[PDB]
């Protein structure tokens, strides 16, 4: 259960893996994109996980129809705006929305810098209209190779005043993190924070590399650390964040069952693990369900769920002043 | 792929497991039913399978919120009507819609005979407005016991001029078929056809009991027959229909993977097996997806998928005249 008197964060939330099916249908029709189906219920299985996919890359294909309908920059602004509304309705007080502008732009060859600007505009309008707090994380989609990721990084950095961090996401096995060392040097020299998807499809060596050579202070998933006691020791004493995504790990077959998900053992090890959605529309979940159903099925007690909620606040890419303010604001509730 | 020049049937399709999430929200608000969430995206994981459930009854719990909002007889009429529109939109030419009026009625204590009449009315209005062909199958929900099922059967038979068959559905292992012998004697005495959910959670012994003691000429699922070579010979020799539900069997964990689903081996044994949805809204699928994605993943060639499509026509609870007319109507398309 969500604790009302604590801020509720979502720190690992892909806005371009969270496109409403109704929006896919409308933009698909607006741009003449031939979709596999033409009603909400018949399109649902093509844009949403039906049962667990056998791999991370099989799961990633489910996001494709959502970005296939981004026919102009206004479409990207719309999806970004709608994502702020969805975060509000999911009870989130502070959301970090991550997005890959290269991935969003590639089906209709949109200008990647234009896509970054449109997403900034859409989230800014959404924050104004819906009243939650939000920050942006730019993703380098490793899947498309280092050259595409450099083009994507250039676009992200041109709006660095509005973006708090850069992420590495996509096909972890096919494009290991040691190919992006010089990309993340540019990220840190620009003063941005670093989170990295690691230890999901690949093993603990990917997490070590992200920590040591990419400068990650948060890791997306990180579930393979359960096999590396020294790594779990390091995560705890260096306060590296673990962005846990329970349903996502099931649906990529990264974790065979919630009963064996490592989140509970991470928390028992004093690791700063937090609870997140990942790709809510693709997965068919939202944040309250992860708290109310998934986390108890992963064996967490209510005390452990509250600890994880607090960890999300501590891990946010915010100043301590802003974290203080969020805690003090939520403490008046409940 | 669906074969356009062939009739498309759905013979195993629970109307009370196919209630639109938007309709759940609207009726929930109408009748003051406190739902676990209040928007489409947040309510979805509570009314739809997220990943495979560990058991049949864990899957069945996903249906509860849809029937919890059936606050009056007109709500039942509405979801029956909306079910015909959904079948039309799923490209179905002939649907057999099955429903448990006792289950629909129990949350708000509706008159069970009233629910049956409302469902007949709604499907009749839908068949008029949407133009497909449909029949009704009344379900005894074994889950609630022999007395409840007798009351349910009485209500179904009061409309037997508008219902073609009676089914047994629910918790198969908790309420075995041998408890309902007298119920299905009444079904056959009234002249109705018999289909039985069997060989899903229990073994092939349950399928034998349905055939020999309940008089079933079609079996819902029947996936455990793959372990009984004598039963497979019998199914083929006696033309006993097998109503296959690919996604459903994954989501109940009845079958470990589509590649190991028995549908392909059934067809190769000459068994009349057909492709169906089961509970499309709960599963997050629809019939074209089963044909286009699930069936190839189950290893079927296009030739076998076509044979399964023809098998659905042959297994329909229709006269040979009506089957000929369906074939003739579809033959002009493509
Ligand atoms: O935001 C879109 C980009 O992120 C990837 N992406 C989206 N969701 C995930 C991704 N990557 C890796 N792991 C699985 C899950 O956490 C796809 C695309 O490149
Ligand atoms: O029509 C609603 C009734 O049918 C049951 N029911 C609904 N879907 C299924 C059911 N039963 C058994 N097997 C799994 C799947 O095929 C639930 C309720 O009793
Ligand atoms: Na779902
Ligand atoms: Zn992610
Ligand atoms: Zn069924």
From Swiss-Prot, chains A, B:
Its EC number is 3.5.4.4. It catalyses: adenosine + H2O + H(+) = inosine + NH4(+); 2'-deoxyadenosine + H2O + H(+) = 2'-deoxyinosine + NH4(+). Pentostatin binds at residues 14-16, 141, 170, 200, 221, 278. Transmembrane segments: none annotated. Substrate binds at residues 14, 16, 170, 279. GO terms for biological process: adenosine catabolic process; hypoxanthine salvage; inosine biosynthetic process; nucleotide metabolic process; purine ribonucleoside monophosphate biosynthetic process. It comes from the Bacteria. Its cofactor is Zn(2+). The active site is at residue 200. Binds 1 zinc ion per subunit. Zn(2+) binds at residues 12, 14, 197, 278. The record marks 221 as: Important for catalytic activity. SUPFAM superfamilies: Metallo-dependent hydrolases. Keywords: Hydrolase, Metal-binding, Nucleotide metabolism, Zinc. HAMAP family: A_deaminase (MF_00540). Belongs to the metallo-dependent hydrolases superfamily. Adenosine and AMP deaminases family. Adenosine deaminase subfamily. This is Adenosine deaminase. It comes from Vibrio cholerae serotype O1 (strain ATCC 39315 / El Tor Inaba N16961).
């Amino acid at each position: 259960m969500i604790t009302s008197s604590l801020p509720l964060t979502d720190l690992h939330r892909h806005l371009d893996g969270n496109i409403r099916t109704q929006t896919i249908l409308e933009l698909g029709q607006k741009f003449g994109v031939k979709l596999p189906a033409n009603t909400l219920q018949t399109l649902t299985p093509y844009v949403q996980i039906v049962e667990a996919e056998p791999s991370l890359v099989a799961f990633l294909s489910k996001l494709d129809w959502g970005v296939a309908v981004l026919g102009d920059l206004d479409a990207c602004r719309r999806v970004a705006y709608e994502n702020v509304e969805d975060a509000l309705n999911a009870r989130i007080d502070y959301a970090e929305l991550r997005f890959s502008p290269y991935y969003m732009a590639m089906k209709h060859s949109l200008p990647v810098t234009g896509v970054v600007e449109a997403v900034v505009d859409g989230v800014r309008a959404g924050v104004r209209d819906f009243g939650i707090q939000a920050n942006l994380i730019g993703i380098m989609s490793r899947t498309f190779g280092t050259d595409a990721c450099q083009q994507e990084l250039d676009a992200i950095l041109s709006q660095k005043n509005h973006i708090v961090a850069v992420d590495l996401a996509g096909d972890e096995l096919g494009q290991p993190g040691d190919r992006f060392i010089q990309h993340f040097k540019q990220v840190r020299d620009a003063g941005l924070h670093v989170t990295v998807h690691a230890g999901e499809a690949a093993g603990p060596e990917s997490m070590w590399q992200a920590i040591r050579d990419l400068g990650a202070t948060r890791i997306g998933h990180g579930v393979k650390a359960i096999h590396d006691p020294k790594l779990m020791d390091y995560l705890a004493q260096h306060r590296i964040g673990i962005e846990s995504c329970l349903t996502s790990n099931l649906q990529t077959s990264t974790v065979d069952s919630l009963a064996t998900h490592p989140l509970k053992r991470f928390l028992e090890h004093g690791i700063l693990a937090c609870i997140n959605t990942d790709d809510p529309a693709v997965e068919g979940i939202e944040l309250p369900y992860e708290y109310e159903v998934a986390a108890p099925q992963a064996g967490l007690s209510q005390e452990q769920i509250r600890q994880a909620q607090l960890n999300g606040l501590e891990l946010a890419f915010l100043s301590d002043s802003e974290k203080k303010a969020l805690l003090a604001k939520a403490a008046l509730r409940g």
